Symmetry: C2
Subunit: 313 residues, 2 copies
């Protein structure tokens, strides 16, 4: 099977994500890396009677060992939103975190597929891209910003509205990973379905604010962790099945693309043996989505620039 | 499918356990109860595009609503304590919690299958039994102490020693769920295997101190949560396949039994439509195991009594 490393394995997302990856039959080696508590999480996980062999890595000094020979790097690494935290003080911190980790990835496994979860994806994926570019290891086929939880939420909220089982629903979601950059293409839902105007609006707003919804429900003390781990693993699994060589593995991801005038954009991508085999275009949008698409590009562009400039300085 | 409630869902174990249950296809309704943060975990869990419908419940005043109509109650409820333990101040606190929660179970769903995880199982399962008896809802076919993590650990450690994939290993573990009361029947390992004396001893000791191993790795700040959730779900699933009507569902669990002179003991049990369909005896033991069994019985009786007397006062 494949080798997977999780950077930030001891955090809220990291831990449950490590547990699911540990259970995945396609994983043969699992590396858990963090700057704190990695040994502990690692012991816990290690008792699981599943195929993957797990090892833990603690501190910057051990980052390289964790990344080496990996097929897939999953990066939920990042710091908690607080209160005190602005949304920038945060960016500053996470941007640094991503930068550091990416420099590590650039050095130790240029050909590993990277699943970047570190918030804000809209900026951190471009940050990652710059780092890789500034290191000559940039392969746009291999950098994926995880937008899967957007899709997950979409499927769940649409299924409830449609009274269907979420497992029988698929909603393409494109654009970016934050606020109005998240653009659920309700017009492309499967199974074919009809939504009232209020439904489209409720659905779109709710899918765009899913994170905030959990944050508030956790009374500011925490943000989504479990649904995130679950989404991250569903996505990682698709990447592994792609690496395995399965045909038709398609998922939405925030990637380097030429689908729009923006350098990064989330849209459906086919996952194969070398990462992205094909970035699909948006497909037919209705008027509501075209307008949404415009709102998203506007915010996305600055978000993309904040990240590019973060590194290009 | 089935209705499942998790008492203590916002805790260390609870959250990841809730996540996994949410993903279990036999679960149709998932109730998540706690005295704190239930709303937040539930919101998080609800975004998952899986069949199970999840609802949250916060505080004693909502306990009854959480238990009503459940097919399976999974009770990881309990406090951690960490610094100034005793395991006897803990016991006091958790015996309390178990009592309260069991009283509630006695009232709202006498026929639900109960998976009790609250530490110390060796005592809390008898406490639970007492409560159910003292309320006339005691069905010994429906109270199971989850000892699965013991089996999980065993499978994993034995597999490592035999250089096998843990998935192809099975180790019956009997007796109790703590220290020397945990008796791994290495002589009954499948696939048939041979161990050196030192291996028998290393494996036995390590399986008995598994929890301590994690607690220590966690530098005292926490104990096994992920492998526990993983083990608990594995077990809850077997209970559900039993309920479903599947043939041959066998798992070890700490239960009311007449296998030994002790009232409660862990051994393979067959799970069916009514909970325990059959408690298997220990099967052939070797000398080492008969001695082991003797150590176990002595410590277990006291632990069983500490439980009983707690209630019978």
């Amino acid at each position: 099977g494949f080798k997977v490393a999780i950077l930030g394995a001891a955090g809220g997302i990291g831990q449950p994500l490590a547990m699911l990856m540990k259970m995945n039959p396609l994983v043969s080696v699992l590396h858990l890396y963090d700057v704190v508590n990695a040994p502990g999480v690692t012991a816990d996980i290690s008792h699981m009677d599943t195929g993957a062999v797990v090892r833990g890595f603690l501190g910057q000094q051990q980052l390289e060992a964790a990344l080496t020979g990996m097929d897939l790097i999953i990066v939920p690494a990042g710091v908690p939103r607080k209160p005190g935290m602005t949304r920038d003080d945060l960016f500053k911190i996470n941007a640094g975190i991503v930068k550091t980790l990416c420099e590590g990835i650039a050095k130790c496994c240029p050909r590993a597929i990277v699943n970047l979860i570190s918030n804000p994806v809209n900026s951190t994926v471009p940050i990652a891209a710059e780092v890789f570019k500034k290191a000559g290891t940039y392969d746009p086929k291999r950098l994926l910003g995880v937008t899967m939880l957007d899709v997950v939420r979409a499927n769940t909220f649409v299924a409830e509205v449609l009274g269907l089982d979420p497992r029988d629903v698929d909603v393409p979601v494109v654009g970016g990973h934050a606020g109005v950059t998240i653009l659920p293409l309700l017009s492309q839902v499967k199974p074919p379905s009809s939504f009232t105007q209020e439904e489209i609006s409720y659905l779109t707003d709710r899918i765009q604010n899913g994170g905030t919804e959990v944050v508030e429900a956790k009374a500011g003390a925490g943000s989504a962790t479990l649904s995130m781990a679950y989404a991250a693993v569903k996505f990682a699994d698709a990447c592994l099945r792609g690496l395995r060589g399965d045909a038709g593995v398609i998922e939405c991801a925030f990637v380097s693309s030429q689908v729009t005038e923006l350098p990064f954009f989330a849209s459906k991508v086919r996952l194969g043996r070398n990462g992205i085999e094909e970035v699909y275009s948006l497909g037919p949008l209705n008027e509501y989505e075209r307008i949404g698409l415009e709102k998203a590009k506007k915010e996305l562009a600055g978000s993309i620039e904040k990240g590019v400039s973060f590194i290009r300085s």
